[PDB]
């Protein structure tokens, strides 16, 4: 069973909602999102490869700090929750370029209230996939200023924007793109199309009221 529906008000339901509530860029976004349904994702194949990747990272010397699990988010269109939760998140599904080519990595939002470039419209409805991730050893990069962006940095698990903590407002210029995580993984001689240190964990449906 890939999806396990959770009953609203239950412990498991409020745990998933608590991941979202604790991950806002503006914690007062708690008044604007109503999470009306939620499922845990149980994809044994993806969880196997996440667990395998974590033990390889520890084999290659990453610190226990770098082995920690955290969460990141993706708002998903056209009822494609099914494909990402069953197949995993693949390269080429984002149009963001700020941290490297989307053909070489996958982009996830750091903040659960910052899921698209422009503000959400009142009454909007959406589906948000919650991924568990290992940021591992992070490569911090400056946003591009007339220079070609880097290929994914070998021996690091993701790219992040160097000064993203400067971002405090959902309306700051390019807040959405500057608060992304960029996950990638080199195979042997090729970039993997699906980084294994990203794994779908839960799905929620929301309505938005500003």
Residue numbers in the entry: 111 to 259, 269 to 329
Q: Would you copy out the relevant sentences from the publication that reported this structure?
A:
Here we show that TASOR is the central assembly platform of HUSH, providing binding sites for MPP8 and Periphilin. Structural and biochemical studies reveal that TASOR contains a catalytically inactive poly-ADP ribose polymerase (PARP) domain that is dispensable for assembly and chromatin targeting but critical for epigenetic regulation of target elements.
Despite extensive trials, we could not induce the wild-type DUF3715 to crystallize. Hypothesizing that β6–β7 loop disorder precluded crystallization of the wild-type domain, we purified a variant with the Δ261–269 deletion. Validating our design, crystals were readily grown of native and SeMet-labeled samples, enabling X-ray structure determination of TASOR DUF3715 to a resolution of 2.0 Å by single-wavelength anomalous dispersion (SAD) phasing. In TASOR the key residues required for catalysis are even more degenerated than in ZAP or RCD1: all but one of them are replaced by hydrophobic amino acids. In TASOR the extended β8–β9 loop has elevated B-factors in the crystal structure, and broad NMR peaks caused by fast T2 relaxation. We have identified that TASOR activity relies on an extended loop unique among the PARP family, and a single point mutation (Y305A) in this loop is sufficient to abolish transgene repression, endogenous LINE-1 restriction and genome-wide H3K9me3 deposition.
